[PDB]
Homo-oligomer: A and B are copies of this chain.
Amino acid sequence: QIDRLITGRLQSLQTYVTQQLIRAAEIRASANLAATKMSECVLGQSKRVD
């Protein structure tokens, strides 16, 4: 009975950690973009359109 519960909860936790890693990669990309905007729009004047 605990073997069934362990494999179910371990699959749930592995799914959660995989989704968190993908979302953390997305948030890291957004934060790298935000740091680029902080460097190029706030700390200087940008010729890049939009």
Contacts and interface: CB of A to CB of B under 8 A. Distances in A.
Interface of A: 14-15, 18-19, 21-22, 25-26, 28-29, 39-40, 43-44, 46-50
Q: Give 7 closest A-B pairs by Cβ, nearest first.
A: A44-B49, A39-B50, A43-B49, A39-B49, A21-B22, A40-B49, A40-B48
A38 to B, nearest CB: 9
Given A22-B25, A25-B22, A25-B26, A48 B46 contact: yes
Nearest to A26: B25
Contacts of A26: 25, 28
Contact of A47 (B28, B47, B50): B47
A6 to B, nearest CB: 12
